[PDB]
């Protein structure tokens, strides 16, 4: 993906699922990307500031999507006590 | 007296502790009976964090079962006389090398003399009053190991403050990291 | 699975993690060794002796309280039987089935079960010859087996 002179020779570098590290192919039309608004200290949403997650079609089809997103959001500040490790 | 309570009396620190045995044996008519047959072989001082030191006392293994009847009190007493010390008793055990394919034959190596077996017994002696209830070994991505030893939550107050000294002692004797944990 | 059927059960004992005597137990090792020898003179097998000590006394496991297993303790005192007890019980069963068949030659089912018992004898006896607790050329045979147990 680099040639001998050190030049990049990929077309593009794919996105990877934040739940499972799988590559998201160019035709996985079931995959989605979620944007969560950042919140100002006066309690109002700031325009154009996001926390972002990506999920593969495999996870969504299997019904794990909601549980995975609770875990990710809770190790960021977005949730308090929804998810439990045990 | 002193050279007759040591199995050898080569050096002065053992003479100090030997004297303490003779002293304590008089202070109570009870100890006059129990302590009389006991002897110890060597002492080593190991420095630990916080400036303290561990008085590691080495005992002949066939007599070890006797000290367990008197190891309480003795620790109470000796940590008064030698202020700012932690005292622990260990049995001396042989360890025999593993036979090579080239070596000439010898009598079959008893399993109790293997290196793995001896290190396990050392750890059992350190925490003497408490039982060990489980073990874990962690293999970190950096390529090194740590053991965790889980202790029975019974009478732990007798050792509860010593744990850091045990970690330092065990490392000196073996080179291995351990940590102690107490399940509720 | 079972050696001679489709059964798949998993029931068994589960011995404790701790390898040293429980804190509430307080007899001496010599005391319990005397008990073991006492029952052996009375004619009990190692299996039976272990049961009595478990539930009539505090003895959780003899190997933990003493240093040794019950079978070795008896052998060290000259009380060892001429053949191992599990092989003994197999031969005893075979004799009683063979007796039943003397009266009931139509009992095709019993005839089938006898063949299975005798296969277990051969597989076990072959083991004991290899570790030399039985003499070589010891052999089970239908006629003499009755006197061997009796």
């Amino acid at each position: 993906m680099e040639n001998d002179k050190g030049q990049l020779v990929e077309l593009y570098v794919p996105r990877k699922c934040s739940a499972t590290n799988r590559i998201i192919k160019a035709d996985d039309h079931a995959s989605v990307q979620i944007n969560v608004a950042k919140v100002d200290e006066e309690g109002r949403a700031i325009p154009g500031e996001y926390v972002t997650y990506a999920l593969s079609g495999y996870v969504r089809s299997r019904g794990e999507s909601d549980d995975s997103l609770n875990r990710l959001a809770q190790n960021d500040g977005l949730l308090k006590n929804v998810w439990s490790y045990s | 007296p002193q050279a007759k309570i040591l199995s050898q009396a080569p050096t002065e620190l053992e003479l100090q502790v030997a004297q303490a045995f003779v002293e304590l044996e008089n202070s109570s008519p009870e100890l006059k009976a129990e302590l009389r047959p006991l002897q110890f072989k060597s002492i080593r001082e190991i420095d630990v964090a916080g400036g303290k030191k561990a008085l590691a006392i080495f005992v002949p293994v066939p007599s070890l079962a006797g000290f367990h009847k008197v190891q309480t009190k003795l620790t109470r007493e000796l940590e008064k006389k030698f202020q700012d010390r932690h005292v622990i008793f260990l049995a001396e055990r042989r360890i025999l090398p593993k036979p090579s394919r080239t070596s000439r034959q010898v009598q079959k190596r008893p399993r109790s003399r293997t290196l793995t077996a001896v290190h396990d017994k050392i750890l059992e002696d350190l925490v003497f009053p408490t039982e060990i209830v489980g073990k874990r070994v962690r293999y970190l991505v950096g390529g090194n190991k740590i053991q965790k030893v889980l202790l029975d939550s019974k009478d732990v107050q007798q050792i509860d403050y010593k744990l850091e000294s045990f970690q330092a002692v065990y490392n000196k004797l073996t080179g291995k990291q351990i940590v102690f944990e107490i399940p509720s | 699975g079972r050696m001679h059927s489709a059964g798949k059960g998993i029931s068994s004992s589960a011995i404790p993690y701790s390898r040293n005597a429980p804190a509430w137990f307080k007899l001496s090792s010599e005391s319990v060794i005397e008990q073991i020898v006492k029952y052996a003179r009375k004619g009990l097998t190692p299996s039976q002796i272990g049961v009595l000590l478990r539930d009539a006394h505090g003895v959780t496991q003899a190997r933990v309280i003493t240093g040794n297993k019950i079978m070795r303790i008896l052998k060290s005192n000259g009380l060892a039987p001429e053949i191992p007890e599990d092989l003994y019980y197999l031969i005893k069963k075979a004799v009683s089935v063979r007796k039943h068949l003397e009266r009931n030659r139509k009992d095709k089912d019993a005839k089938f079960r006898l063949i299975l018992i005798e296969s277990r004898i051969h597989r076990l006896a072959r083991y004991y010859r290899t570790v030399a607790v039985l003499p070589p050329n010891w052999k089970y045979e239908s006629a003499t087996a009755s006197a061997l147990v009796n």
Binding site: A19, T20, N21, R22, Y58, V59, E64 | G134, K135, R136, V137, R138, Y139, L140, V141, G143 | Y17, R19
Partner: protein, 129 residues
């Protein structure tokens, strides 16, 4: 009738990885399993792992990070001469420039590239990529 404790362990890891789990437990352990996992860990295919004592051959819990495509065992353990190593890598690995074949040699357990530097051979165990 477990004929190979190593074969069971790598089979459990594959099935967990395919479904997307982050951890797996394997029973029993052995010295050979530990050595095999340490090689996989060195090259970054797995996280840390932890051994549980039980007086009965123990258990292992492994953390999984999503990088592993496949691992597997070769049975029987064929004898391999130094000239043969090039054939096994052509058959088993997906490309000339990543993945590993794993050998037991009297110099220890190691991947096929280390064996070339040290110039040793022995018997094949398995592969990772």
């Amino acid at each position: 009738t477990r004929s190979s404790v190593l074969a069971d362990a790598l089979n459990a890891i594959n099935n967990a990885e395919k479904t997307g789990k982050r951890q797996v437990l394997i029973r029993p352990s052995s010295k050979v399993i530990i050595k095999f996992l340490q090689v996989m860990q060195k090259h970054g295919y797995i996280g840390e792992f932890e051994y549980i004592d039980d007086h009965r051959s123990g258990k292992i819990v492994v953390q999984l990070n999503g990088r592993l495509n496949k691992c597997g065992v070769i049975s029987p353990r064929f004898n391999v001469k130094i000239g043969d190593i090039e054939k096994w890598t052509a058959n088993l690995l997906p490309a000339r420039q990543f993945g590993y074949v794993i050998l037991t040699t009297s110099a220890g357990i190691m991947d096929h590239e280390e064996a070339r530097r040290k110039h040793v051979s022995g018997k094949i165990l398995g592969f990772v990529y």
